[PDB]
Amino acid sequence: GRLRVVVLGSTGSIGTQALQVIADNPDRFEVVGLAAGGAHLDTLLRQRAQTGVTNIAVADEHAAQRVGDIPYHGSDAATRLVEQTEADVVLNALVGALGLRPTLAALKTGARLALANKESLVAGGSLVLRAARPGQIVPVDSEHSALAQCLRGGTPDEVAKLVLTASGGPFRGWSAADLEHVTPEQAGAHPTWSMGPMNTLNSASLVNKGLEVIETHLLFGIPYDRIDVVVHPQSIIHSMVTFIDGSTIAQASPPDMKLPISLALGWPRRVSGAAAACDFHTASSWEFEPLDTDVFPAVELARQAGVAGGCMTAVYNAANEEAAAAFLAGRIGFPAIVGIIADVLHAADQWAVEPATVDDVLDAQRWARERAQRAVSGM
Amino acid sequence: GRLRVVVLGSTGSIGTQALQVIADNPDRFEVVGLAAGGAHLDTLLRQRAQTGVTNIAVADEHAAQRVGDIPYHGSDAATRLVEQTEADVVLNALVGALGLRPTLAALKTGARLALANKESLVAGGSLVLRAARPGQIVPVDSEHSALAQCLRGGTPDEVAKLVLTASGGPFRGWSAADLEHVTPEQAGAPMNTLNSASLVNKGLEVIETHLLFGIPYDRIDVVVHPQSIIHSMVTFIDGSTIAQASPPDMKLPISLALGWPRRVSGAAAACDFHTASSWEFEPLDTDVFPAVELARQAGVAGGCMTAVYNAANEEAAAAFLAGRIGFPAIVGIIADVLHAADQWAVEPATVDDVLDAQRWARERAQRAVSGM
Ligand SMILES: O=C(c1ccccc1)N(O)CC[C@@H](c1ccc(Cl)c(Cl)c1)P(=O)(O)O
Ligand SMILES: [Mn+2]
Ligand SMILES: [Mn+2]
């Protein structure tokens, strides 16, 4: 009855919330593994003391002189923890490149993978899919969690459309001309040595939604031409599924990541009192409007990369990271982020091949960065 | 593959929409029987012509005399059609008291009952429930169709609340004082329309929801949603709500009731999320509209009380239409009648028990009218 949980990336926002859900629900879950990168050693050590969990890994080579009592440490040590720890669920909330090998290891163990790491699907693609059995991957992000719930409304042959909702970001309703000269600070993107500013930039870019469309295709096996994005400023409905008879099923909740986290951990069972429900005793309205795809071409560009397949989505994401970083640094204008991704992709025919190994994904990503760094440089 | 379908009340709105669904899906369904009152004989004869179905029932004896070719005629013609005809699904879209016996006949056959007759469950209560097996009654109403769909979102132990949406009728935001002056014309009256306006329809649907899904009344909520695009929602124990949405079109829940658990391709248009739209929610003004509160009271009391609730409504509704009482007196009289109905919390053993409750309720409502 009690599920054994490995929490990877335990010190970040997703990992800390998952540990609160588990602490609230010791009848349903027990923590059996923790992993974080060496920069987060002090917090990881606090978690060991608080959870009493000693099976912990420092997920990289860093803090190398302070790991004398850590059971796993070094490059790829989170993968080793996953390989060696009996569990029912691996929550992978590692950030970026770190997340890929532990995802692959988790799938090989036969455990459920509660996947928070975007890298795994966006870059890994068919590497990750070929390692998974049907139903083994359960998403942690609000939208994909919404979609997985709404897909319960019918059999696969009855699915007409998947509809992801999007806030539209801070430039919702702006013209191309309006966006020509915006600053990173106008996007709500301010410095911090984390993926925070990148994440907020991707939200302004609509690249966030592009990535979520890619993840949707891979998670649910629905063609790109049947994955739509709708703007919904309230973010109460987190996504919807439209079925062949005309019926749409939607999932709605006040924003709170503990809900989709709880569900991914307990899948298929829901977790009592994980989050607060919508209160239908106070007036509200849920608004929907089309995405302006002329102004925000990032989403259709993600579909184009996705349709090409293989390492093309790794290329899309890696080119975005470089271009977005350039925009953050004040080196390029806002429109050039997606302009650069498009340029890199146009040159990227060699990367439509499926990746044979992790190294092919890494090669595609290095190529894409180099290619994006060139585009940025002149300009 | 082909489900044989008996359509009761074939000439009404639901009936005709159902025939069109069946005609569009001959691989899925076949019409094998029709029943109507006879008021719209033109339609029935036209339906006989288009479907080829000669297996027909007519309530009116003088209207059946008009053709003299109808195998079933009289006050129980529909019931006798159900008893005789080999079917997989009986769609009962008969109106009012006409629907109860046919519902009982249908359940007795073992066929799925696609139920569009509110009276069956609301008045029939446990008598209808005792006649049914798990899953045999499949609701046609948009709200209950939505609920059944949203329940796929989890297991039964995970359900926190069922939330029915209500249009609010044309008198959203009106005071009791405002409602005093309402004419039949303003309330769109047309018994479903009046009930929509008075919120009694929602009251009835709350009772139906309890009896169909076995959720307690204190966990069946109503929210006002004027667009009627969200048709109902379920809130699960983890805080997640699952909602069903579509442009209002009965062909959707009709198709689903006939083909359950399988969906029917192209039954209805989907929401078009490429055009801007707004879905508004607001609480019901329960001071001005207590019909749902009253329905819960009747439901909790149980037995014949919901039969009393519905019959008092119909009498009071008739009085309002006749010009004998004002609009707020409809639900006012329902309350008065229910409050006098302590003796009626007894379980109905037979159809006559239900008819006795309804008689009592009609007479008590009339006495209240003769007061005002
Ligand atoms: O299920 C239905 C219905 C739905 C669509 C079309 C016709 C009837 N009804 O119960 C009719 C009354 C309900 C209703 C439902 C949908 C609409 Cl579009 C309207 Cl006007 C009224 P109510 O919320 O007022 O109680
Ligand atoms: Mn998201
Ligand atoms: Mn209804």
From Swiss-Prot, chain A:
Binding annotation for NADPH: 11-14, 37, 117, 119, 196
Pathway recorded for this protein: Isoprenoid biosynthesis; isopentenyl diphosphate biosynthesis via DXP pathway; isopentenyl diphosphate from 1-deoxy-D-xylulose 5-phosphate: step 1/6
Instruction: Name the Enzyme Commission number(s) assigned to this protein.
Output: 1.1.1.267
Cofactor(s) required, per the database record: Mg(2+); Mn(2+)
Q: Which residues bind 1-deoxy-D-xylulose 5-phosphate?
A: 118, 142-143, 167, 190, 203, 208-209, 212
Q: What class of enzyme is it?
A: oxidoreductase
Residue sites binding Mn(2+) per the record = 141, 143, 212
Keywords carried by this UniProt record: Isoprene biosynthesis, Manganese, Metal-binding, NADP, Oxidoreductase
Q: Which reaction does it catalyse?
A: 2-C-methyl-D-erythritol 4-phosphate + NADP(+) = 1-deoxy-D-xylulose 5-phosphate + NADPH + H(+)
**The keyword Oxidoreductase belongs to this UniProt entry's keyword annotation:** yes
- Pfam families xref list: DXP_redisom_C, DXP_reductoisom, DXPR_C
Classification via InterPro entries: DXP_reductoisomerase, DXP_reductoisomerase_C, DXP_reductoisomerase_N, DXPR_C, DXPR_C_sf, NAD(P)-bd_dom_sf
Q: One biological-process term from Gene Ontology?
A: isopentenyl diphosphate biosynthetic process, methylerythritol 4-phosphate pathway involved in terpenoid biosynthetic process
Molecular functions (GO terms): 1-deoxy-D-xylulose-5-phosphate reductoisomerase activity; cobalt ion binding; magnesium ion binding; manganese ion binding; NADPH binding
Q: What does this protein do?
A: Catalyzes the NADPH-dependent rearrangement and reduction of 1-deoxy-D-xylulose-5-phosphate (DXP) to 2-C-methyl-D-erythritol 4-phosphate (MEP).
Similarity comment:
Belongs to the DXR family.
Q: What is this protein's name? A: 1-deoxy-D-xylulose 5-phosphate reductoisomerase
Query: What is the protein's species of origin?
Result: Mycobacterium tuberculosis (strain ATCC 25618 / H37Rv)
Lineage of the species this protein comes from: Bacteria, Bacillati, Actinomycetota, Actinomycetes, Mycobacteriales
This protein's gene is called: dxr
